[PDB]
């Protein structure tokens, strides 16, 4: 069980651990999160009590380095920071665990909720999505562009999400135009699978790590990424089994966690009645459809 | 985006433009059959694209062998329209490609722009226009090429016969959507008009009579009262 040291906390902040979140006070005595499971990526994320604009945060997965929180009066922020010195950063860890200054990863032992979310995101992932490889941790904020909405402006600071776009050459072969652009799966299974992803898990992990920055920082990009990879399966009649099966599980957890209140921002009408009740695959998303059906049935 | 009554004068312009309307592709008899169900026939259909500004017509006729062993033919429709209307834009030289595509139905922008992307600095843009371009198949001219194909072929005219000579595009343009609207509200009564006068013909090379400006003013007097008569029918108005 890995820990997060905070050096102090010198602005109110609500403070973001994976799905949980706790407010600390201007000066509080906080010195950071402790019992933070091993064998999955983490994401530790900030909103300021006195300018809630600006949702940004940290992606790391504490088996790559010890990672501690500090914050900067220049840039105004909580920044992440690696410690190089081993023994240094076991003592900082040991002095506040022993005053208790620290808050408890506050897992529930039959709750499989964060692995169910990122089951297939892998840090190495991210660090291509998010481009800053001095840093073992990624950073992301509410405002980041997509390299496809930069098309659509600083490089450095955009989300590398792979391309999506259902009316463009790499989506359409020549003569196949109608097939194409009504059954995707030529893109699906031969641009996306074989040819850029590899493999179904790299892009389930893409599809997770959008979802996870639309709904903790409410970056817009991100939601526009989770619904076009969503909507790509959808949209092929040709799906291997074990995909189908296994997006069904990944969206109803996405759907499971969301917060009730944002479904109205975070979830595309368009997209979610075309998948459930058009698509293809309409009838091959029993979970998800049922969550929906249950959860959220305005939007529908 | 779309073509409406603030961007008329547009269409006359001299960026090269193109009107697509697919209302006359897909075409059916629906018939009751032995066993008392329904079936349809489909007879031969026509793409009609029309420059507006020099009045050239290239009228592909859709033969009835491309629908045999097809499934969703009106769906088949659009995209067979949109792949001869890209195969016509790639057999034009450069320099006569449109610029713009205008489809005169919703129903043809994705088709029509999946079938484009090798042109992305041609716009494909919709209407608000109701233009009444399905009553082509009123021009006996153009009915009779479309009724006697054996197969695919492509005709061209000029559906302003000799008109810019005497008028600009805009006038021309005028004329034919009212001539068109006419067919299409009253087609009996719309060719009663144009040929009640048995000494102004139809030159072999042309589509509409040979009407003088004089005599053109009359008829189309005449169309727009046949569309009035007509409304107020409709309606009780």
């Given at each position: 069980m890995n820990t997060?040291?905070?050096?102090?906390?010198?602005?109110?902040?609500?403070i973001g651990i994976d799905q949980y979140s706790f407010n600390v006070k201007e000066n509080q005595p906080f010195h950071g999160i402790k019992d933070i499971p091993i064998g999955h990526v983490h994401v530790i994320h900030f909103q300021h009590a006195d300018n809630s604009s600006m949702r940004y945060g940290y992606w790391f997965d504490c088996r790559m380095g010890n990672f501690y929180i500090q914050y900067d009066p220049?840039?105004?922020?909580?920044?992440?920071?690696?410690?190089?010195?081993?023994?240094?950063?076991?003592n900082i860890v040991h002095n506040f665990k022993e005053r208790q200054m620290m808050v408890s990863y506050p897992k529930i032992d039959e709750d499989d909720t964060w692995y169910n979310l990122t089951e297939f995101v892998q840090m190495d992932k991210i660090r291509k999505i998010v481009r800053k490889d001095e840093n073992q941790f990624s950073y992301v904020d509410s405002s980041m562009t997509t390299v496809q909405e930069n098309e659509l402006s600083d490089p450095a600071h955009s989300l590398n999400y792979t391309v999506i776009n259902f009316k463009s050459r790499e989506?359409?072969?020549?003569?196949?135009?109608?097939?194409?652009?009504?059954?995707?799966?030529?893109?699906?299974?031969?641009?996306?699978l074989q040819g850029i992803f590899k493999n179904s898990s790299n892009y389930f992990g893409e599809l997770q790590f959008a979802f996870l920055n639309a709904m903790f920082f409410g970056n817009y990009g991100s939601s526009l990424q989770w619904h076009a990879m969503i909507e790509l399966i959808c949209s092929s009649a040709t799906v291997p089994k074990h995909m189908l099966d296994k997006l069904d599980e990944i969206l109803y957890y996405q759907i499971k966690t969301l917060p009730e209140q944002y479904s109205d921002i975070l979830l595309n009408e368009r997209?979610?009645?075309?998948?459930?009740?058009?698509?293809?695959?309409?009838?091959?998303?029993?979970?998800?459809?049922?969550?929906?059906?249950?959860?959220?049935?305005?939007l529908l | 985006g779309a073509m409406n009554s603030s961007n008329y004068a547009?269409?006359?312009?001299?960026?090269?433009?193109?009107?697509?309307?697919?209302?006359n592709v897909y075409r059916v008899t629906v018939h009751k059959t032995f066993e008392g169900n329904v079936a349809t026939k489909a007879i031969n259909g026509c793409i009609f694209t029309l420059n507006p500004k020099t009045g050239h017509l290239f009228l592909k006729i859709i033969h009835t062998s491309v629908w045999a062993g097809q499934k969703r033919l009106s769906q088949l429709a659009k995209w067979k329209t949109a792949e001869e209307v890209s195969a016509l834009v790639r057999s034009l030289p450069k320099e006569e490609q449109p610029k713009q595509i205008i489809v005169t139905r919703k129903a043809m922008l994705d088709p029509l722009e999946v079938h484009m992307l090798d042109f992305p600095n041609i716009?494909?843009?919709?209407?608000?226009?109701?233009?009444?371009?399905?009553?082509?198949?009123?021009?006996?001219?153009?009915?009779?090429?479309?009724?006697?194909?054996?197969?695919?072929?492509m005709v061209l005219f000029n559906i302003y016969d000799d008109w810019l000579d005497r008028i600009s595009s805009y006038t021309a343009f005028?004329?034919?959507?009212?001539?068109?609207?006419?067919?299409?509200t009253n087609?009996?009564?719309?060719?009663?008009?144009?040929?009640?006068?048995?000494?102004?013909?139809?030159?072999?090379?042309?589509?509409?009579?040979?009407?003088?400006?004089?005599?053109?003013?009359?008829?189309?007097?005449?169309?727009?009262?046949?569309?009035?008569?007509?409304?107020?029918?409709?309606?009780?108005?």
């Open positions: 997060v040291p905070f050096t102090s906390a010198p602005i109110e902040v609500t220049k840039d105004g922020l909580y920044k992440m920071m690696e410690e190089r010195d081993g023994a240094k950063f076991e989506a359409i072969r020549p003569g196949h135009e109608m097939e194409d652009f009504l059954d995707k799966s030529y893109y699906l299974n031969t641009v996306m997209v979610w009645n075309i998948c459930l009740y058009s698509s293809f695959q309409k009838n091959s998303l029993h979970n998800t459809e049922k969550i929906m059906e249950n959860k959220y049935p305005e | 547009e269409l006359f312009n001299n960026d090269i433009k193109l009107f697509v309307d697919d209302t716009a494909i843009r919709p209407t608000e226009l109701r233009l009444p371009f399905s009553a082509a198949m009123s021009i006996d001219k153009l009915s009779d090429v479309v009724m006697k194909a054996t197969e695919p072929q005028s004329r034919l959507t009212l001539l068109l609207r006419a067919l299409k087609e009996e009564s719309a060719k009663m008009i144009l040929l009640s006068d048995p000494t102004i013909t139809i030159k072999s090379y042309h589509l509409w009579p040979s009407f003088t400006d004089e005599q053109w003013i009359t008829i189309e007097s005449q169309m727009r009262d046949l569309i009035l008569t007509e409304y107020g029918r409709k309606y009780n108005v």
